[PDB]
Design a protein around this nucleic acid. Structure first.
Ligand SMILES: [Mg+2]
Ligand SMILES: [Mg+2]
Ligand SMILES: [Mg+2]
Ligand SMILES: [Mg+2]
Ligand SMILES: [Mg+2]
Ligand SMILES: [Mg+2]
Ligand SMILES: [Mg+2]
Ligand SMILES: [Mg+2]
Ligand SMILES: [Mg+2]
Ligand SMILES: [Mg+2]
Ligand SMILES: [Mg+2]
Ligand SMILES: [Mg+2]
Ligand SMILES: [Mg+2]
Ligand SMILES: [Mg+2]
Ligand SMILES: [Mg+2]
Ligand SMILES: [Mg+2]
Ligand SMILES: [Mg+2]
Ligand SMILES: [Mg+2]
Ligand SMILES: [Mg+2]
Ligand SMILES: [Mg+2]
Lengths: 210, 147, 102, 203
RNA sequence: CGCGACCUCAGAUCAGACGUGGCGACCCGCUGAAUUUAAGCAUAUUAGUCAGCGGAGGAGAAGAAACUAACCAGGAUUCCCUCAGUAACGGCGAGUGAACAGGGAAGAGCCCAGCGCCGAAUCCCCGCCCCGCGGCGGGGCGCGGGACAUGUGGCGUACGGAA
RNA sequence: GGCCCCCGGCGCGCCGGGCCCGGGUCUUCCCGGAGUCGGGUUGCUUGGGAAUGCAGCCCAAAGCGGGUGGUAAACUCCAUC
């Protein structure tokens, strides 16, 4: 029974929940296990970045996130095609490739080509045998580093372009933003009917002739 | 800390602070929010006016990020930028006015609470209030819409 | 007179240049192939027509073509499938009519 | 190629030809036992799309299944309980008849490992099916690398666990908004995830 | 009234293989209550929960979009944090109740049928030799059997593919 | 820290086999899983609400088609598999 003021509150402890309580006494033991396993995987992939493969830059979806930029899942085929890396090979040099990515705008594409180009510059492809054929880099850039790269490879940093102080032309000052927005709202709202009434009026003008 | 709790001080006394006329029985009201309409009604309708009943429109697949529009007041617009933009300005003598990209700092709308200091600006933002616009103009600045 | 890009209204959103890529090969599925067409109609002269199809042809002949569609919708399910079927049946019926006139 | 023809013909099931044949097949099948090993696949085409291959150690049992729904096995009515659960007649099994068909083929030939099934007709009383089975221990399967996944002992009794194409369908899993139940492994697992008090160390 | 092909079917203590029961903490498929709550009760709730049956593995299941979204767009599955006790359901009462985005753990992608080309170019079992043999394999040689054109193998599968 | 056993795992040599295995550029061809989808339905199920998912029964497809695009339907553009 409720007594004088309080949130009329609904707890969800009506099922047999104590049968399915999940404690976290693992977690330290877990955290270590991951960490060992992590250090092992590094050591196995000896001069290769611990990170993984290189991954594309990509914008988030939705109005909310929109402005931010992450690492994506893998580079698109167009981006590999333009960079000039054979897709089947790109996997073998540590370049993530997804093939389900569309590519809508050319601003996101050229950026991601630039990424791969830069990667290919600062990559040290070892030759297959110790005897050195084409592609494989010099023994200088090899002895000076068979070094792993700690952290994510060529990390993405969401960055801003500084706008210098303008002078405010008599035109910026002239603008009526709030009004403009109200107008722009109503024209989206009313576009469709306006077009139907105009289509009606056009039919009335043609009907007047016959 | 049981040490501090009340049951330590109740030891010895019969009823354990629950009285002996009426006792501590199991669920004398009913369990939980039972009787909202009948027999607990008065509490509900003098501390939760409007619990019972429907109202307004349903909306099936609500996704909150569509309606994302965090606001900021003129009150503290200059807070977004380093003091030395607001200082290199009220100085300078070009009549420059520094830009304030509000969307960079994580606010989409610019609403209009507060006095804005007499010092020109260019506020870039997704949305503006009417008053926020007006105040900005009165300072001697320019609102700027961005996508 | 100052056309700032807006986040709201008709020609809204961030103004970005569009690449016009090759459309994915996945998108061309169901496109009727010359050899598949031949197979399809090669079998429509072996197997012939279904019973409901035949009944609809008889309605269409009579020029009672709404009742034909009402029948096909109840039979097939949707309107759009029923309409697309009624056109096929009307095409078949026409190519019989052209074939008879010789 | 002939298979595409066959395929398109079999889609004309209301046709005069295929209806004749289906009636004659279905008569014939009805006049045999509920489970018999077909010497070759009634539908060669279908079998290939489902992964049959006309080599040794692929088998095909044609299995009959009784049709219609599932009446509640309780004496008289007497589903004693709240009258939500009073139903006995108009209620319906979760798995399909085709799955039941496979499950029975699987039951019978324990060594054999159910791959996949297809349909061959239906009377009022029965349905008919054709379950492709495989020996996991016939060298021609063992040594062929592309099949030797079935010889692994995780694939014991696929049909029993809800893992053939048919018995997958009851589980109610696909990508996208039309699912969510089964957004872990399976129906049961999501419930499990959703009804765990995760009780953290620090809270 | 024979002999011979094949088809469909039998029988073998035929040669050689496999399956059967157990365990069941975790896992997959079915099946499925009622105490209980609602201060009564029938829908609801308890709960797709206990009991019941089935089948597994060292994990299982899931998984390479007939996906999300509606953005300047993301990009298999699983797991955690969040979303969120929210959108929604509900004698709109009791009560119940997800998903996307975002940040992480991890990270890996592939193969057929078909359509086509290639003298079936493929497979299984026999038997003789050389090696190897306590996870029955390699190489060679047999007009030695069989499977297979009612389709085996190489190329190839939507990220396009072939010539 | 030592010695002795055994076993693993990775490095080099020799032999036996297999294995003549690319990429871009222009042309000519090639292309998709049916009693399934979808509809009606009844029963269970779901937060999923003029049907989230699974079922039985009846109907029962197409190929610039099909599916999705969280309020039933028709017209219409888009998006997305
Ligand atoms: Mg990582
Ligand atoms: Mg007290
Ligand atoms: Mg007392
Ligand atoms: Mg009292
Ligand atoms: Mg009840
Ligand atoms: Mg289905
Ligand atoms: Mg067992
Ligand atoms: Mg009660
Ligand atoms: Mg009571
Ligand atoms: Mg009572
Ligand atoms: Mg329930
Ligand atoms: Mg149990
Ligand atoms: Mg598995
Ligand atoms: Mg799939
Ligand atoms: Mg997801
Ligand atoms: Mg909150
Ligand atoms: Mg529930
Ligand atoms: Mg082939
Ligand atoms: Mg329910
Ligand atoms: Mg709608």
């Amino acid at each position: 029974a409720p007594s004088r003021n309080g949130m009329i509150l609904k707890p969800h402890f009506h099922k047999d929940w104590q049968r399915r309580v999940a404690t976290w006494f693992n977690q330290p033991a877990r955290k270590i296990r991951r960490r060992k396993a992590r250090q092992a995987r590094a050591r196995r992939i000896a001069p290769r970045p611990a990170s993984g493969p290189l991954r594309p830059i990509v914008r988030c979806p939705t109005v909310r996130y929109h402005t931010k930029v992450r690492a994506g899942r893998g580079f698109s085929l167009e981006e590999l095609r333009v960079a000039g890396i054979h897709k089947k090979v790109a996997r073998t040099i540590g370049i993530s490739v997804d093939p389900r990515r569309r590519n809508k705008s050319t601003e996101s594409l050229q950026a991601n080509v630039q990424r791969l180009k830069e990667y290919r510059s600062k990559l040290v492809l070892f030759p297959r045998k110790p005897s050195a054929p084409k592609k494989g880099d010099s023994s200088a850039e090899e002895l000076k580093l068979a070094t792993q790269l700690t952290g994510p490879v060529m990390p993405i940093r969401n960055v801003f372009k500084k706008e210098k102080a303008r002078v405010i032309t008599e035109e910026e000052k002239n603008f009526k933003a709030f009004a403009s927005l109200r107008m722009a709202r109503a024209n989206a709202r009313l576009f469709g009917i306006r077009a139907k009434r105009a289509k009606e009026a056009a039919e009335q003008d043609v009907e007047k002739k016959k | 800390p049981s040490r501090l709790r009340k049951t330590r001080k109740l030891r010895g006394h019969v009823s354990h602070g629950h009285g002996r006329i009426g006792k501590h029985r199991k669920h004398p009201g009913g369990r939980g929010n039972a009787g909202g309409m009948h027999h607990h009604r008065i509490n509900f309708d003098k501390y939760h006016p409007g619990y019972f009943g429907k109202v307004g429109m349903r909306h099936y697949h609500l996704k909150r990020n569509q309606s994302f529009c965090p606001t900021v007041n003129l009150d503290k617009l200059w807070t977004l930028v380093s003091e030395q933009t607001r200082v290199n300005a009220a100085k300078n003598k070009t009549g420059a006015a520094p830009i304030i990209d509000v969307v960079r700092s994580g606010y989409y709308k610019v609403l209009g609470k507060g006095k804005l200091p007499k010092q020109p600006v260019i506020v870039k933002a997704k949305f503006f209030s009417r008053r926020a616009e007006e105040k900005i103009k009165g300072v001697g600045g320019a609102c700027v819409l961005v996508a | 007179a100052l056309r700032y890009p807006m986040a709201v209204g008709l020609n809204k959103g961030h103004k970005v240049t569009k690449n016009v890529s090759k459309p994915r090969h996945s998108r061309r599925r169901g496109r009727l192939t010359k050899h598949t067409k031949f197979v399809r109609d090669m079998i429509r002269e072996v197997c012939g027509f279904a019973p409901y199809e035949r009944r609809a042809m008889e309605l269409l002949k009579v020029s009672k073509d709404k009742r034909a569609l009402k029948f096909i919708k109840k039979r097939v399910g949707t309107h759009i499938r029923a309409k697309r079927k009624r056109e096929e049946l009307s095409s078949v019926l026409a190519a019989m009519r052209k074939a008879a006139a010789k | 190629g002939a298979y595409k023809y066959i395929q398109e013909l079999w889609r004309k099931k209301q046709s005069d030809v295929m209806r004749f044949l289906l009636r004659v097949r279905c008569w014939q099948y009805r006049q045999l036992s509920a489970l018999h090993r077909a010497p070759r696949p009634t539908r060669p085409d279908k079998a290939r799309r489902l992964g049959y291959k006309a080599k040794q150690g692929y088998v095909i049992y044609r299995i009959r299944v009784r049709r219609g729904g599932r009446k509640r096995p309780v004496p008289k009515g007497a589903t004693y309980g709240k009258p939500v659960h009073h139903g006995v007649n108009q209620l319906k099994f979760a798995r399909s008849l085709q799955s039941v068909a496979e499950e029975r083929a699987g039951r019978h030939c324990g060594a054999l490992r159910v791959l996949n099934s297809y349909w061959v007709g239906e009377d009022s009383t029965y349905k008919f099916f054709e379950v492709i089975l495989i020996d996991p221990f016939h060298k021609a399967i063992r040594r062929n690398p592309d099949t030797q996944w079935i010889t692994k002992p995780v694939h014991k009794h696929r049909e029993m666990r809800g893992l053939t194409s048919a018995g997958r369908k009851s589980r109610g899993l696909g990508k996208g908004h039309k699912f969510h139940h089964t957004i872990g492994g399976s129906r049961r697992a999501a419930w499990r995830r959703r009804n765990t008090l995760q009780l953290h160390r620090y809270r």
